[PDB]
Design a protein around this nucleic acid. Sequence first.
RNA 1: UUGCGAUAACGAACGAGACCUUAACCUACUAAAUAGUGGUGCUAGCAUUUGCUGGUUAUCCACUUCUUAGAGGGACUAUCGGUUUCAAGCCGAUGGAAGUUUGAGGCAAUAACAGGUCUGUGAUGCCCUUAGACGUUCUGGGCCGCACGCGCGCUACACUGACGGAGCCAGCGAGUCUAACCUUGGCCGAGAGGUCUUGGUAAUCUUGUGAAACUCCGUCGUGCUGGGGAUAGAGCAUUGUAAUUAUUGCUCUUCAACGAGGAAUUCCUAGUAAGCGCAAGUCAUCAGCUUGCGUUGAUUACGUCCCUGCCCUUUGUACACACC
Lengths: 107, 141, 69, 56, 56, 141, 206, 145, 63, 61
Amino acid sequence: QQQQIIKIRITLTSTKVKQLENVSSNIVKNAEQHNLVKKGPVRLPTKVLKISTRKTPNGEGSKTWETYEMRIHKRYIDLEAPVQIVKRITQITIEPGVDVEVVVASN
Amino acid sequence: PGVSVRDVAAQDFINAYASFLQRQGKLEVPGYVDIVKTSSGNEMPPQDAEGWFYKRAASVARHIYMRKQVGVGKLNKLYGGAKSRGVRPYKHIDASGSINRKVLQALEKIGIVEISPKGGRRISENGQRDLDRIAAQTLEE
Amino acid sequence: QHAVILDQEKYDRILKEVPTYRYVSVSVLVDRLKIGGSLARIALRHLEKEGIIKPISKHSKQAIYTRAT
Amino acid sequence: IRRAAYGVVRYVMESGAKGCEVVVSGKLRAARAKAMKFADGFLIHSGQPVNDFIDT
Amino acid sequence: ALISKKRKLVADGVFYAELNEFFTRELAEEGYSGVEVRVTPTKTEVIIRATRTQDV
Amino acid sequence: AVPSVQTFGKKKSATAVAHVKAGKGLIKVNGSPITLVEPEILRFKVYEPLLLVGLDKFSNIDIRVRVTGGGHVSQVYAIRQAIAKGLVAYHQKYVDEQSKNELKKAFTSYDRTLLIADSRRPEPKKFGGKGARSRFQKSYR
Amino acid sequence: FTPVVLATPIPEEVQQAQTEIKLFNKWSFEEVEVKDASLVDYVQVRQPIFVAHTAGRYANKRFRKAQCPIIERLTNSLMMNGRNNGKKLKAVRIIKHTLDIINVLTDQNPIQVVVDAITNTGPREDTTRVGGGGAARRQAVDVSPLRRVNQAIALLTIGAREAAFRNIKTIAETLAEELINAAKGSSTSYAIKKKDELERVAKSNR
Amino acid sequence: SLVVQEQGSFQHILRLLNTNVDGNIKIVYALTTIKGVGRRYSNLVCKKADVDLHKRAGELTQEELERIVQIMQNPTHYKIPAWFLNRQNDITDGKDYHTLANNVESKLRDDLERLKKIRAHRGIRHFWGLRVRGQHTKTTGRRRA
Amino acid sequence: TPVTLAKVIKVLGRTGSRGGVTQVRVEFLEDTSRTIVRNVKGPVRENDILVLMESEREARRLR
Amino acid sequence: GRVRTKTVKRASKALIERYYPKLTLDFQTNKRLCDEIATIQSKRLRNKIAGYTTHLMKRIQ
RNA sequence: UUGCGAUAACGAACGAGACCUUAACCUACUAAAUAGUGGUGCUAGCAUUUGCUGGUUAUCCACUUCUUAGAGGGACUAUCGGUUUCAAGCCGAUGGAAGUUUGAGGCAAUAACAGGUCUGUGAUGCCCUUAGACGUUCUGGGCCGCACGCGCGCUACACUGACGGAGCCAGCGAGUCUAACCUUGGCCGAGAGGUCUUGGUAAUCUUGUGAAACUCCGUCGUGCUGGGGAUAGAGCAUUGUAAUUAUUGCUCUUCAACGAGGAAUUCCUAGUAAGCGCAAGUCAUCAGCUUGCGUUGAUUACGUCCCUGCCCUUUGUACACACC
Ligand SMILES: [Mg+2]
Ligand SMILES: [Mg+2]
Ligand SMILES: [Mg+2]
Ligand SMILES: [Mg+2]
Ligand SMILES: [Mg+2]
Ligand SMILES: [Mg+2]
Ligand SMILES: [Mg+2]
Ligand SMILES: [Mg+2]
Ligand SMILES: [Mg+2]
Ligand SMILES: [Mg+2]
Ligand SMILES: [Mg+2]
Ligand SMILES: [Mg+2]
Ligand SMILES: [Mg+2]
Ligand SMILES: [Mg+2]
Ligand SMILES: [Mg+2]
Ligand SMILES: [Mg+2]
Ligand SMILES: [Mg+2]
Ligand SMILES: [Mg+2]
Ligand SMILES: [Mg+2]
Ligand SMILES: [Mg+2]
Ligand SMILES: [Mg+2]
Ligand SMILES: [Mg+2]
Ligand SMILES: [Mg+2]
Ligand SMILES: [Mg+2]
Ligand SMILES: [Mg+2]
Ligand SMILES: [Mg+2]
Ligand SMILES: [Mg+2]
């Protein structure tokens, strides 16, 4: 309870890179004003989920194909932080659209 | 004047080390040579019929030298090729696993490779020494 | 049609015709002598070991040999 | 439908919209079907402005 | 919950599509237009955009 | 520390990262001397930046090239681009700029791809045929 | 002018490549005068290369293949009939052995022999069709120099490939015999025989 | 590992195992004109017989021919590993056989007429002249067979 | 046979029914300012030298 | 085919019709001042408008 | 219908273009033990006296070139010649990562078609059927049946090759506990495969997906041959409740046509054609298919209206349900 680090990693997964990098910017600013040592937001390769269909619902016509994509962007921010004052401001202004996971570590 | 097994050409080294193994006669050829094909993807057995196991063991020893961990399945993928499927198109098929497993076990008992706690076989210190002496001879001919 | 064994008269015809062949290869022995390609390869190797033809390329699938001197 | 579609078109256009289109397709007291449009104002049909400024 | 991200985000999309057709079929006589899902820690909130909130 | 640059060369998907530093004439390619590259008939492609400017320009540098990606020809082109760009980068940062410009002119009068990466990228395949332009054969009957 | 020594020993045969860029490491591009003016600036020599493999863009404009080297162009015409598509390494090996054989037989410079073979079988007159279909006529017209070079290379490599198909002789030596007979002018080679056929038809259909 | 030379005293076309084998063909490929003897079987029999593999089948010794015939006819006694054979686990005695020159058509007729005799479906298709391995007969085999 | 060389001055334009034949003005290398219009089969450009088997035939095909 | 449409051309005419004692014969500074004196919605369209404006200035020269 | 011009029109809108996505450049920024690199706090080998390596990020230090992805920059046909009605533009050269709309797509007007789909739908009018059912389920068969005609393909006719050994390199994907997916390694087996473990809900592990063509060295040697591998026999396995009408895989044997294909006809202008494989889709099993991906990489043109189709203008019309 007296300035003890936790070695947490926050992984941020979304499909909307505006909202997602806004959440990661907020996390980086929070650490940068609480003076927490942190590895910056590491950007994973964005995954593309491609689904190739025929456009026709029957089987008539020229064989026309549709590629749909879902794009998934992933970041993670490592931290060494006091948990009881991190979670006093983590649980508020909860982000919509972005899946967050906080995993503690002892490595 | 230091020579590793990288300063010399692959084919020259593998011929020289296969001839060294065939001249020392310690490598315990398994005895189902002369009958086997080296892959399901092959058509014919090796045309050397005496030798080719020394050449395979020389290539495997040089391969372990240039890598860190190679297992039997990695060796089978390495030595596989394109299989003729007759009227259907060609395809990659892995090589024979018993031949490569027995090559690895043979180089274990002549001390070239060892069992490598991260996986397959790494090279031994005596293996580095023997391969470096062969490479030095292959250059200084 | 093409000889796969070599008789003695074919052997002396090789040693008295492959010198003064300006360019020598496997197909050159196969068409100007009447031997097959296996004896042509063997005879090329033997004749450069003796040294009356000398190599230029010595690739597999294509050997270029010229006469010595 | 010429009352209904126009009463939707004018309502959209004086609701503060840049353009409006209504297409009605089907059969109405005739067996042989036809389609008919009711467009007022300005519409874009091509490009990323369709995904930006058009509700469908 | 030991599911991949590729499958979790797809399943979130399928959940959104299933709620969208469920509210499209249910709330059609009080003008449902849209639905927005916000997944939070130990709550998920479902906002129904309708023209008549009183009959929703 | 020691004077050193790092550059790269890029053919279609091959990338050769070259570490050039102050040394004694070493030119290694991912473990091995420049004189054994495979393909043998394309070895003069990676001899070209050595021979356009003379080997005397390489007597006080050690070049170590790690090439990955691509294929056999593409790695050779990325290697020669990496070596030429590394020698120009070393002469830009440590030797005279006039010497660097004479090296650049010697490379570019022979081949622009020694210093400039080829921008030719594979065009995507389209439905309706096996290739990017080619279509499936159509019947009428 | 001296053999430089390095921590990697560059061999002496390739250290003499500093003073002169030869084809593969043997044949000079000097004294490779093109005997047929009107094929200068389309048979491109005089900018030497080390090997007949370059990833050069020559198809993006109309006359860039006139600045492509002639050995690379003859090499490029060997990588066809379908099963040899790609396989420029095989084509470059065939060109290397072809120039070896063209040096062994007929001891002059093989690059000069292949450019004499280009200029001896580029056809100077060719016919075209006139009329809108089968009920037609045939008119003799002149031939562009770039077209002459193109069609010379095609006629040499096609008659090399046909002569090497289904017999013991290899492509690198049927190409060598084709180039030597063309460089003399013989009417034993496919390319000279088709050039004579083309120009005889042109005279008959002026 | 080094190559020395060999002199070719020769004999012409040779009857072996009631089949005219052609000398001027290397021994593995010359013995493949015997039915039941393919390329793998030829190579393994010529390796079990200590026959030089480069020995052209007409310059081969008569006693070497006899050893080749013995290993071909009795292959399980020369450590040929019995997954390598024509008729493993046979049909009537459970014995691994390798069937040779004139007997391959004989065993083929024995298999087919056994299969006709039990009125099995595949024997019926062989009697009808059709394909027997489930091939589609609508478009293929439509000028002969 | 003594062929004559000729230098292309102006590319006058594509002729022929399929457009493969082009029509050019050429001037003779010996005896300059002696000029003829010729039909050329291949890709031709200004300053190209081309070899005439005949020196007396004017091209007529145009448009 | 590098023919420029009327959205580029009309914008360039309407830029030279009122900002002549400004923009000069250089694409780089013309490209920079199109960002101030106009609201072009994309960088590619700005670059086409600036280049055609520069092409027109070199003609009024 | 992009503009310039001409001009009884002038000034606009939809479509084109702009746009969005992807590819190409950034030693400029922001960074990263899920990407690497260099040192060495650390050590450890082999040849040696520094070359090739193997390993510990509060049981190391630092950096970002390479990789990733955010924010931007960049190209506008720049510049300069030539040509043009000194226009719109076009060609050449130089520079440049890029000068083919920079490459490739996505989106895409006015209107139609008696185009396809009622068998994708709990989309649907009407009709038919509804307990001896045309509902539903279960068992078995069939959809694959073979004198034959046609279409898309795969494999070939070989030496620019086959075989053997050796070398040896990608990129796009995908993956299991919200239950059995991708599987390394070890062992057994000729092989297919079995088995014991392991790692991975994934830039972490499969996976450097060590792919194939290719390269080198050998064997063959112009013979339907060691080209080709159809057809067929016997056996061993795997998937599945179930393999017979061979699911597929392996091993041995059998070893057909086919020696480059009339008449005709298809696709294609540069990282394109072609060759080469790989992944995904469907999938318990089954790829000769498709969708994408990368590897190797040409020839020929930068045109025309001759053929074919489409568009416009003029023209003729007794057609407007519009030549059916
Ligand atoms: Mg491989
Ligand atoms: Mg292999
Ligand atoms: Mg628009
Ligand atoms: Mg558009
Ligand atoms: Mg392709
Ligand atoms: Mg042949
Ligand atoms: Mg046989
Ligand atoms: Mg079949
Ligand atoms: Mg960077
Ligand atoms: Mg209909
Ligand atoms: Mg329907
Ligand atoms: Mg209905
Ligand atoms: Mg259906
Ligand atoms: Mg049923
Ligand atoms: Mg069916
Ligand atoms: Mg089709
Ligand atoms: Mg091979
Ligand atoms: Mg990879
Ligand atoms: Mg692994
Ligand atoms: Mg055969
Ligand atoms: Mg069955
Ligand atoms: Mg069936
Ligand atoms: Mg599959
Ligand atoms: Mg099936
Ligand atoms: Mg299908
Ligand atoms: Mg027409
Ligand atoms: Mg009427």
